[model samples]
Target: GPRSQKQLELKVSELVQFLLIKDQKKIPIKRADILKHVIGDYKDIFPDLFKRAAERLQYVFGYKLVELEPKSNTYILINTLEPVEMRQGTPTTGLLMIVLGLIFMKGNTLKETEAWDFLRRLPKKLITEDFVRQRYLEYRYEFQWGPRTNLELSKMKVLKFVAKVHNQDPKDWPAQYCEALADEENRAR
Candidate 1:
């Protein structure tokens, strides 16, 4: 009978859900982890599972399953639409709120040196590399917020987080404030 196919489909669906949950945190999934956790003893046409899951994710959720590391066998989910929305990273993001804010306030490009100064301006703590890998912060000769970050978050959202710290008010910074409004207003329709 086709029982083997049916059993395989069941595993594929669960894998899809598992991918969604982890990607919600913007973290990649490991193939070995899948083999141990989600797949277990149910092993038949294992390579076919990924193709089915990728098809469903693309057609149904506007997401794509792509390989991030071949040698490590790491896979990640990416949004084909690149929409903006809320996410989780927690207070580790305390620096993120500040980064988006200060970058905007300084005209959107802070020199690496000055940025590092600010990094130690408060006596140092933590940040950067991971955020860069997550595509939340762009770093090179200078520091700037990134595309995936912008697509995952809004200008107003970043500004609001910034204002919460600097307070004054979310609207007081006219330049970035207006830019935020323009960004949202341009789309969201």
Candidate 2:
């Protein structure tokens, strides 16, 4: 069967328009949802057109396409031009304190590596620590000192608390020591 390129182009334009309208309302449209709605029963005929529309919606219009999970095809569409409110304060610092307190209460002082791994789990972009650190350095503040100050301070407090509670230096212990202690605690319960 022969296909008309002009007809395909028109279809792609229509699909792009549909997605543009959906995106204007701040709604996250899924790739799967479009397959049945706009693509109709011709998904196999013009799959690339949908992909082209999504790409144009993103790069040409500055929309952000976020995949929810690495293994899943699910996606979320967000407008990059949406207004955002800037808040004062270091969110990462606050989060570091909270996590340190939690770990301390759970009776474990994490190693530096362990602490960093946990810190990475926090919403880094939302917290804006990367930008904050750069901005501090650009402003002539001691960036390196301020950079890990929050994490280091939290670590110091947890270490001191652990020492006071158990009268032992947690830093001298292996990383697996925390897991062993947790296992013992669980068994005793």
Candidate 3:
């Protein structure tokens, strides 16, 4: 039988809650760790978003996060992801938040045309504005939504999954992905 709306909403809500947790710095989780733990834990709650975060984490974050060291056979531990910095002096920061939430929601199903159309069709307040787009472009030239890191891509490769869609070579990956990948690289350095 098809999933119920309540189930879907609950799933989305849980994923969003975790996203809020990791992005808010309530925890200090590595990117790969996020894919390993966060996505895995919430997969049933939001399979598509879980898959998307896993994809983004692999390609953009570089690799799945492994425990820095092996744990004792009987040890109990629960590592969590750190959150992103909160926007200052604002009651709400909806645009990027909504963008990210939706991105995770669609996973591999989100096509390029669909993404742009989706972005453009958003309510003016919820979408990136032309003025903000110019400023964003001026400051951060790179932008793309798909697989942002070689490591993330490599993991999918290892799993026998095609992270990047056909016809979009990794070299020609979108700037958003590149920028995110660059950030991952910088962190690794």
Q: Largest lDDT belongs to which candidate?
A: 1
Q: lDDT of all predictions, in order shown?
A: 0.73, 0.55, 0.40
Give me the overall lDDT of model 2.
0.55
Instruction: Please give the lDDT score for candidate 3.
Output: 0.40
Per-residue C-alpha lDDT of model 1 across residues 1-189, encoded as one tens digit per residue: 255766777888998898888898777788888788887765565687878888987888988889987676988888898676134467656666676667777777776667677566652323565666764555455778877677667777777776766566545668677878888797677
lDDT of 3 by residue, 1-189 (tens): 366877555554554445445644545445455456545554454447655444444444433423334651111113333433222554324454343333433431233344556666754433443424432221232233333323233222311122232334353334244544555566577
- Per-candidate TM-scores read 0.45, 0.36, 0.20
Write down the RMSD of candidate 2 (Cα, Å).
Answer: 16.9
lDDT digits (tens) for residues 1-189 of candidate 2: 444888777777777777777766656666777676777655777657867776877878876666666856555667788664012677654554454444544444333344456667755433434545532221322122234444344344445444554567555334535654664565556
In TM-score terms, which candidate is top?
Answer: 1
TM match of model 2 to true structure: 0.36
* Distance from true location, Cα of 20 in model 1, Å: 45
**Clash-forming residue pairs, model 1:** none
Comparing 1 with 2 on TM-score, the higher-scoring candidate is 1
Decreasing lDDT order of the candidates = 1, 2, 3
